[PDB]
Amino acid sequence: ASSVNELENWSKWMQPIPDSIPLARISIPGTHDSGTFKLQNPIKQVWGMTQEYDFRYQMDHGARIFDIRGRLTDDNTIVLHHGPLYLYVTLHEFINEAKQFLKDNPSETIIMSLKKEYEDMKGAEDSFSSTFEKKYFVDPIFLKTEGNIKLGDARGKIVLLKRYSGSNEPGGYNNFYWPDNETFTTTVNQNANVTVQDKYKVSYDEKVKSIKDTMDETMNNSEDLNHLYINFTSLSSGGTAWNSPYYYASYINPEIANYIKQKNPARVGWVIQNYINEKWSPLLYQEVIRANKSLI
Length: 296
What we know:
With 296 residues, this protein is an alpha/beta fold. The protein has a single domain (1-296), classed as Phosphatidylinositol (PI) phosphodiesterase (TIM Barrel, Alpha-Beta Barrel). The protein has helices at residues 42-47, 55-59, 91-104, 128-137, 151-154, 204-220, 245-263, 284-290, and strands at 28-31, 65-72, 78-82, 85-90, 110-116, 158-163, 182-187, 193-198, 227-232, 270-273. Strands 1, 2, 3, 4, 5, 6, 7, 8, 9 and 10 form a ten-stranded mixed sheet that branches. α6 links the parallel β8 (193-198) and β9. α6 packs parallel to α7 (245-263) and α7 (245-263) runs parallel beside α8 (284-290). It is an enzyme of class 4 (lyase). Pfam families: PI-PLC-X. This is 1-phosphatidylinositol phosphodiesterase. Residues 22-163 form the PI-PLC X-box domain.
C-alpha cells in the first residue's frame, strides 16, 4: 500500500520501502553488543551488559542491525563474548533466531556484523574466519551478493558486515580499516563509502556532539546513495559506580530521539544503540524508522 502508517509496525517496517533503495540510504535501528542480555551477575552487568532483552525482542522493536562479537571454541564453534566474558549465547542461537523472524516477516532483512572479540580457544582446528565461513556462512540465508546491496536482494536474508580479516567468501559488506575510538571515513568496496562515529570511551559531552555532528552530516548528505553512515550512540566508561552504559543510555537515548523528532530529518543513518527498550521517553529506534517516511 506504500503508506507511511506501515512504518509503525516495528516487526514489518521495511515492507513499504522500495526494492531499489540501497540499504545504506535506509535509516536503520541497530543494537550494540546485542548478545549481552543473559548476564545476571551484578559485576558482569555493570561491566558488560548493554542490552536487557533477547534477539527476538530487539527485532520486534525495529532493530535490524546486530553487533555480534564472537569467540572460537575447542569444539570448533563460535560463541558470543564481551571481552574475556563468555556470554551464555551462541552464533547458532542468533542465526536460529534471525531465521524465525525472517520466516514471520520475509519483507524484512537483518544485517549481521561479526567481529572476533577474544582469542581462539587453544585446541580449535581452524581459524576464526574459515570456521565461520565453512560451518555457518555457507548456510543459504546469508546473502552472497556484494557491492551497494539493495533492499530487494536482501529481503528475507541476512546481510553480513564483515568486521574480521581473512575472508575468502564473497557476500555482504567487505571488511575495512575501522580505527580505535574514533570517527572516520573509508571505502567498503567500489560502490560504497563509509563514515563511522565510533567514539566509545570519550566524555559524555564529546560523545553527544559526535553523535549529533555525524547525524547533521548525513542529514545534509541525505541523497548520497553510495555512502554508509554508521552512528554509534553507545558509550561506556569506568563503571562500578553509576558510570555504566546503562546510566549513559538513559540520558543519550531520549536526548537523540528528541533531537531526531525535533529536526524531522530525511535521513538519520544506521543508529546503533545500547539498551533498546520501552523505558526512555521519546524512543530512539522509533524516530530512526520514522525518518524513512521520505523514501515512501
